Amino acid sequence: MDVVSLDKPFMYFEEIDNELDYEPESANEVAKKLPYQGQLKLLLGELFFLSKLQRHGILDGATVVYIGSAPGTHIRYLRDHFYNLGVIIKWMLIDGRHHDPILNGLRDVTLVTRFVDEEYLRSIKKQLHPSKIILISDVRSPSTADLLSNYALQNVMISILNPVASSLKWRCPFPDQWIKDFYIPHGNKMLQPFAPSYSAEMRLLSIYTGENMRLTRVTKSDAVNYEKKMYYLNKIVRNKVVVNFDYPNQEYDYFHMYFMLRTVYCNKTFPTTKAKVLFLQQSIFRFLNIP
Amino acid sequence: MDVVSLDKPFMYFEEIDNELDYEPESANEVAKKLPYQGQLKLLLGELFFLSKLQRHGILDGATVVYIGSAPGTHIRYLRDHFYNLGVIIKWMLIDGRHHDPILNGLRDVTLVTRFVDEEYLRSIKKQLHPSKIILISDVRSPSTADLLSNYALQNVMISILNPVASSLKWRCPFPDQWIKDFYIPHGNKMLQPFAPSYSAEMRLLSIYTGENMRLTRVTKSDAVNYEKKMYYLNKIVRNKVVVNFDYPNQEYDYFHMYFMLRTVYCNKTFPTTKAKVLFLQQSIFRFLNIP
Ligand SMILES: Nc1ncnc2c1ncn2[C@@H]1O[C@H](CSCC[C@H](N)C(=O)O)[C@@H](O)[C@H]1O
Ligand SMILES: Nc1ncnc2c1ncn2[C@@H]1O[C@H](CSCC[C@H](N)C(=O)O)[C@@H](O)[C@H]1O
Structure with missing residues (x-):
């Protein structure tokens, strides 16, 4: 068995203290071990992100604009969690695909069947006005061209939305498929427990102070690093x-989930x-129907 | 006569400590009092900006990419000034219009007759590589649509150029012709002596540290402020x-030029x-043929 004692898990990209040459043969290995693992992955990351905003006092009274929300089964858990805590939030879930019917019939949640473009963003901005916006994006097109x-x-x-905070899907294109350098918003590169086995995806968490927007350039060399650090982590x-994690499940991902x-x-x-965890x-596993 | 005693002049936008309701009748007033005043305006601002970079040790060894450089008569003075100081600089002047022939025949200055688009920027970036770039932009299309x-x-x-520093033409669109909010790079809003009488134009001076790029949102309310502060200044x-400025010319613009x-x-x-000033x-006036 592959045992070890750890203090804490890697919570952010920057913490990964080692790297490994990416082995393309890893792509043929089992990507998931749990049913609805993707809903679990999203639920933990978004619970993590939103709890932080609550801690900073910026959640209550906000409208959460989630683009790329469908099916969004796990979102029902998030909504219930904050709703039951007394936090006042409106959810606006937008995707061209259909949402899980469990999301229907809630006055605090608006389901929109639309693929958003810049112009549509402008209209919902004008329509949300003057509410404070929290953006969560999980849109998916594959190619580096798609990613960019x-x-x-x-x-x-x-x-356009000019949100107070944002969680963005973030996976760096592979260095061998580099097209051009680009800018992503500055934020914390949150690592994701229960991501697929060899996924290099993380979530970019940002809180917007002032009227400034800070971006950061990503180059092919950054892409090489992302690949090796994530390959090592995976x-x-x-x-x-x-083994020094006294918990019903000691696998790394549960240790990471605990934090x-x-x-x-x-x-x-x-x-x-x-006991809380x-x-x-x-609670989370029962909701998602994970044994 | 309109006299006053001043300590220093307003060097940056943020220093303007008062405002006035813009009077549209000002547009019919004489915009300039000196011949080649526009070359003078550009020369001082760019001498100011480049001297700062020299002071920070980032000028020497740089390639100055000046877009919207034609005719660029005053640029010959700038080039001579740093060339004679021993600073090693390459100039790349790009405009679809033709440059003043006084710029020809200098090995350190390359004249390009091209209107730049994003793709062309990519090719000159690949071609300048690996030199450090200092960008100066003075491109001109009028409408808020043109400005944006x-x-x-x-x-x-x-x-694309990813310069170490930049000077950008910056005049906020008028609030009454607002189209949409946008972002400009963060920098110092350098005020310009010898600008046209009622011009609201300044130069955005920025130095780029790290791999980050900080932008700042500009709204219609910002546009209202720009209009009133600049109207007051003008x-x-x-x-x-x-009057407490002992100098052959005590008019505000000469006081501002002195600084x-x-x-x-x-x-x-x-x-x-x-004596230096x-x-x-x-020297500057003789070069530009200003009495
Ligand atoms: N322009 C766009 N606007 C809205 N959603 C988009 C989009 N382009 C793609 N997407 C959506 O991005 C999604 C990625 S899958 C998202 C899963 C979802 N976050 C969950 O909780 O289940 C798809 O449903 C897709 O339709
Ligand atoms: N895409 C573009 N690329 C290059 N120059 C451009 C441009 N669009 C407009 N311009 C140029 O912007 C200029 C504005 S006038 C510039 C004056 C010049 N800076 C001087 O020192 O004399 C015009 O010459 C115009 O042709």
Whole structure:
């Protein structure tokens, strides 16, 4: 068995302290081990992000504009969680695909069947006015050409919507398929437990102070680094059994999940962080129908 | 006579401490009092900007990419000034219009007859590589639609060229002709002596540290402010005779010119800042054929 003792898990990209040459043979390995693992991946990251905003006092009273939300099954859990905590939030879920019917019938959640373009963003901005906007983007087109186009749309989302905070899908194109250098908003590169086995995707979390917008250039050399750091994390780290982690499941991803979940606010009072987390995890898995 | 005593002049937009309701009748007033005043305006601002870069040690060894350079008569003075100071610089002047023949025959200056588009910027970036680039933009299309398009081109200039510093033409569209909010690079809003009588134009000076690019949103309310602060500066301030300014010319613009020129480096040693400035001004006016 592949055992190890860890203090904490890697929460952000910058923490990854080692790298490995990407082995293309990894692409043929099993990408997922849990049913609805993708909803789980999204749920934890977004619970993590939104709890932070709550902590900074910027969630309550906001309208969460989630673009690329469908099916959005896990979103029903997020909505219930904050709704039950007394946080006042309006959700606007926009995708050209259809949402899970469990999202219907909630006055606080508006489902829109539209593929957004810059012009549409302008109209919803004029229509949301003057509410404070929290943007979450998970739009998906593959090619580096597709990615760049997505990143370009996401930056137009921030410039038109002018949100107070944002969570953006972020996977750097592969160096061997480099097309051109580009800019992404500055933010924390949140790592994702339960991402596919060899995924290099993270979520870019940003909070917007002032009227400034800070971007950061991404070059092919950055792309080489992303590839090697993420390959190391996936191949080595995520394959560790954290034996000094006293928890029903000691696999790295649960250890990593524990650290995100410990930051979540509950109404119920618990005697230990461990009890809260077990509770939140049980709750999350039951909701998603994960054994 | 309209007299006053001033400590220093307003060097940056942010210093303007008062405002006036823009009077549209000002548009019918004499825009210029000196021959070749526009070359003078550009020369001082660019001498000011480039001297700063020299002071920060980032001029020497750079390639100055000046887009919207034609005719560029005053540019010959700038080139000679740094060339004679021993600073090593290559100039690349690009405009679809023709340059003043005084710019020909200098190995350190390349004249290009091309209207730049994003693609061309990409090719000159690949061709300048790996030199450090200093961008100066003075491109001109009028309409707010024209302006926005210019500002959009200028931001693509910075993103593709990825310069170490930049001077950009910057005049905020009028609030009554607002089309949409937009982003300009963050920088110092350098005020311009000898600008037309009621011009609201300034130069955006920026130095790029790290791989980050900071932008700033400009709204209609910002546009209202720009209009009133600049109107106050033009109507009131620029019309003052700074009587406690002991100089052959005490008009505000010469007082303002003095402060930019005092920052310029000369080979000749002078006993007072006043002697250096008189010298630089005499020199500049002789070069431009201004009496
Ligand atoms: N312009 C656009 N506007 C809206 N959604 C878009 C988009 N382009 C692609 N997408 C959407 O991006 C999605 C990526 S899959 C998103 C999964 C979703 N976040 C979840 O919680 O289940 C797809 O549903 C796709 O239709
Ligand atoms: N895409 C573009 N590329 C190059 N120059 C451009 C441009 N669009 C407009 N311009 C140029 O912008 C100029 C504005 S006038 C510039 C004056 C010049 N800076 C001087 O020192 O004399 C015009 O010569 C015009 O042809």
